[PDB]
Design a protein around this motif. Structure first.
Motif, mmCIF file in Angstrom:
data_model
loop_
_atom_site.group_PDB
_atom_site.id
_atom_site.type_symbol
_atom_site.label_atom_id
_atom_site.label_comp_id
_atom_site.label_asym_id
_atom_site.label_seq_id
_atom_site.Cartn_x
_atom_site.Cartn_y
_atom_site.Cartn_z
ATOM 1 N N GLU A 49 0.817 -1.085 -0.163
ATOM 2 C CA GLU A 49 -0.008 0.057 -0.027
ATOM 3 C C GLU A 49 0.775 0.965 -0.017
ATOM 4 O OE1 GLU A 49 -3.609 0.495 2.986
ATOM 5 O OE2 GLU A 49 -4.135 1.196 0.773
ATOM 6 N N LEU A 50 2.089 1.306 0.730
ATOM 7 C CA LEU A 50 2.731 2.136 0.990
ATOM 8 C C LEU A 50 3.451 2.543 -0.610
ATOM 9 C CD1 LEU A 50 2.389 2.895 3.566
ATOM 10 C CD2 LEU A 50 4.923 2.672 4.355
ATOM 11 N N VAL A 51 3.811 1.502 -1.108
ATOM 12 C CA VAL A 51 4.712 1.487 -2.431
ATOM 13 C C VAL A 51 3.802 2.060 -3.575
ATOM 14 C CG1 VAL A 51 5.625 0.171 -4.533
ATOM 15 C CG2 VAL A 51 5.994 -0.527 -1.879
ATOM 16 N N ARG A 52 2.449 1.945 -3.437
ATOM 17 C CA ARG A 52 1.389 2.279 -4.617
ATOM 18 C C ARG A 52 1.304 3.990 -4.372
ATOM 19 N NH1 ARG A 52 0.392 -1.437 -6.139
ATOM 20 N NH2 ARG A 52 -1.864 -2.231 -5.953
ATOM 21 N N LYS A 53 1.401 4.330 -3.278
ATOM 22 C CA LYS A 53 1.326 5.607 -2.996
ATOM 23 C C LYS A 53 2.637 6.233 -3.294
ATOM 24 C CE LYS A 53 -1.142 5.591 0.884
ATOM 25 N NZ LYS A 53 -0.995 5.410 2.244
ATOM 26 N N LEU A 54 3.991 5.508 -2.962
ATOM 27 C CA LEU A 54 5.111 5.884 -3.398
ATOM 28 C C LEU A 54 5.406 5.902 -5.014
ATOM 29 C CD1 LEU A 54 7.898 6.852 -2.287
ATOM 30 C CD2 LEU A 54 6.302 6.460 -0.248
ATOM 31 N N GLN A 55 4.533 5.249 -5.551
ATOM 32 C CA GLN A 55 4.799 5.294 -7.009
ATOM 33 C C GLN A 55 4.230 6.489 -7.810
ATOM 34 O OE1 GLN A 55 3.458 1.024 -9.026
ATOM 35 N NE2 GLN A 55 1.864 1.691 -7.438
ATOM 36 N N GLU A 56 4.133 6.736 -8.982
ATOM 37 C CA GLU A 56 4.021 7.825 -9.800
ATOM 38 C C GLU A 56 2.433 8.202 -9.586
ATOM 39 O OE1 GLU A 56 4.917 10.028 -12.656
ATOM 40 O OE2 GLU A 56 6.139 10.542 -11.107
ATOM 41 N N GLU A 57 1.981 8.417 -8.578
ATOM 42 C CA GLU A 57 0.528 8.663 -8.224
ATOM 43 C C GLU A 57 0.207 10.125 -8.609
ATOM 44 O OE1 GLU A 57 -2.635 7.663 -7.442
ATOM 45 O OE2 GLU A 57 -2.503 6.091 -5.870
ATOM 46 N N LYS A 58 -0.660 10.436 -9.511
ATOM 47 C CA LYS A 58 -1.027 11.788 -9.807
ATOM 48 C C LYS A 58 -1.934 12.478 -8.932
ATOM 49 C CE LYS A 58 1.174 12.719 -14.209
ATOM 50 N NZ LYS A 58 2.447 13.171 -13.393
ATOM 51 N N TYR A 59 -1.980 11.921 -7.521
ATOM 52 C CA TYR A 59 -3.031 12.063 -6.520
ATOM 53 C C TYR A 59 -2.451 13.320 -5.674
ATOM 54 C CZ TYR A 59 -7.656 10.286 -5.485
ATOM 55 O OH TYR A 59 -9.035 10.309 -5.428
ATOM 56 N N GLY A 60 -3.122 14.603 -5.570
ATOM 57 C CA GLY A 60 -2.861 15.583 -4.989
ATOM 58 C C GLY A 60 -3.334 16.941 -5.298
ATOM 59 N N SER A 61 -3.422 17.197 -6.386
ATOM 60 C CA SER A 61 -4.369 18.456 -6.699
ATOM 61 C C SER A 61 -5.732 18.032 -7.289
ATOM 62 C CB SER A 61 -3.846 19.226 -8.263
ATOM 63 O OG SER A 61 -2.241 18.579 -8.227
ATOM 64 N N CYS A 62 -6.535 18.108 -5.967
ATOM 65 C CA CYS A 62 -7.889 17.704 -6.046
ATOM 66 C C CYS A 62 -8.817 18.950 -6.689
ATOM 67 C CB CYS A 62 -8.406 17.112 -4.734
ATOM 68 S SG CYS A 62 -7.393 16.372 -3.923
ATOM 69 N N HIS A 63 -8.860 19.171 -7.742
ATOM 70 C CA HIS A 63 -9.618 20.389 -8.421
ATOM 71 C C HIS A 63 -10.544 20.150 -9.640
ATOM 72 C CE1 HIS A 63 -8.052 23.612 -5.793
ATOM 73 N NE2 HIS A 63 -6.880 23.171 -5.964
ATOM 74 N N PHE A 64 -9.760 19.439 -10.492
ATOM 75 C CA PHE A 64 -10.517 18.697 -11.503
ATOM 76 C C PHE A 64 -11.675 17.789 -11.388
ATOM 77 C CE2 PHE A 64 -8.195 20.692 -15.269
ATOM 78 C CZ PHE A 64 -7.111 20.959 -14.716
ATOM 79 N N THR A 65 -11.328 16.468 -11.107
ATOM 80 C CA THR A 65 -12.250 15.519 -10.800
ATOM 81 C C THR A 65 -12.220 15.401 -9.105
ATOM 82 O OG1 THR A 65 -11.457 14.524 -12.647
ATOM 83 C CG2 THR A 65 -12.954 13.232 -11.277
ATOM 84 N N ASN A 66 -13.565 14.887 -8.644
ATOM 85 C CA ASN A 66 -13.666 14.687 -7.232
ATOM 86 C C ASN A 66 -13.134 13.512 -6.844
ATOM 87 O OD1 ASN A 66 -15.050 17.461 -6.499
ATOM 88 N ND2 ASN A 66 -16.000 16.204 -5.092
ATOM 89 N N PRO A 67 -12.781 13.277 -5.798
ATOM 90 C CA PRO A 67 -12.063 11.974 -5.273
ATOM 91 C C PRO A 67 -13.232 11.028 -5.331
ATOM 92 C CG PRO A 67 -11.119 13.880 -3.708
ATOM 93 C CD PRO A 67 -12.346 14.429 -4.780
ATOM 94 N N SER A 68 -14.213 11.502 -4.752
ATOM 95 C CA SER A 68 -15.475 10.413 -4.628
ATOM 96 C C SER A 68 -16.255 10.199 -5.945
ATOM 97 C CB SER A 68 -16.463 10.757 -3.616
ATOM 98 O OG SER A 68 -16.506 12.213 -3.762
ATOM 99 N N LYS A 69 -15.627 11.022 -7.057
ATOM 100 C CA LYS A 69 -16.305 10.661 -8.312
ATOM 101 C C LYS A 69 -15.614 9.749 -8.936
ATOM 102 C CE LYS A 69 -18.782 12.550 -11.866
ATOM 103 N NZ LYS A 69 -18.332 13.298 -13.200
ATOM 104 N N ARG A 70 -14.689 9.920 -10.088
ATOM 105 C CA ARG A 70 -14.324 8.998 -11.068
ATOM 106 C C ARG A 70 -12.689 8.666 -10.483
ATOM 107 N NH1 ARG A 70 -15.568 10.948 -16.818
ATOM 108 N NH2 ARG A 70 -16.707 8.891 -17.727
ATOM 109 N N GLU A 71 -11.809 9.532 -10.218
ATOM 110 C CA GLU A 71 -10.696 9.261 -9.629
ATOM 111 C C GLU A 71 -10.514 9.509 -8.241
ATOM 112 O OE1 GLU A 71 -9.081 9.160 -13.225
ATOM 113 O OE2 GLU A 71 -9.391 7.291 -11.874
#
Length: 71
Positions: A49-71
Motif C-alpha cells: 500500500e505504501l509503495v503504491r502511494k510512493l509510485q507515480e500517483e498523480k494524486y494531490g491536486s483535487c480540483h478537476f475531478t472529485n475523489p469520490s467521483k471517478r478518480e
C-alpha cells in the motif's frame, strides 16, 4: 520489518529493513531514500500500500475531478 524505496524511473518497491540500494531485474537500479528509508512498513500488506502511494500517483491536486467521483 519492511521498507520502501524509489527506482530511478521514479518507481517504488518494498524489501527488508536494511536495503540501501536495490536493483530492477528489468534493467535498472533502485535507489532507496537519502537518510534511512522511505515508507517504513511493518505489515507486508501495508508495504504494498505504501509503495503504491510512493509510485507515480498523480494524486494531490483535487480540483478537476472529485475523489469520490471517478478518480
Amino acid at each position: 520489518m519492511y521498507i520502501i524505496f524509489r527506482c530511478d524511473c521514479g518507481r517504488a518497491l518494498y524489501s527488508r529493513e536494511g536495503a540501501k540500494t536495490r536493483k530492477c531485474v528489468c534493467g535498472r537500479t533502485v535507489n532507496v531514500k537519502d537518510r534511512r528509508i522511505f515508507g517504513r512498513a511493518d505489515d507486508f500488506e501495508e508495504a504494498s500500500e505504501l509503495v503504491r502511494k510512493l509510485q507515480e500517483e498523480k494524486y494531490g491536486s483535487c480540483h478537476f475531478t472529485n475523489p469520490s467521483k471517478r478518480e
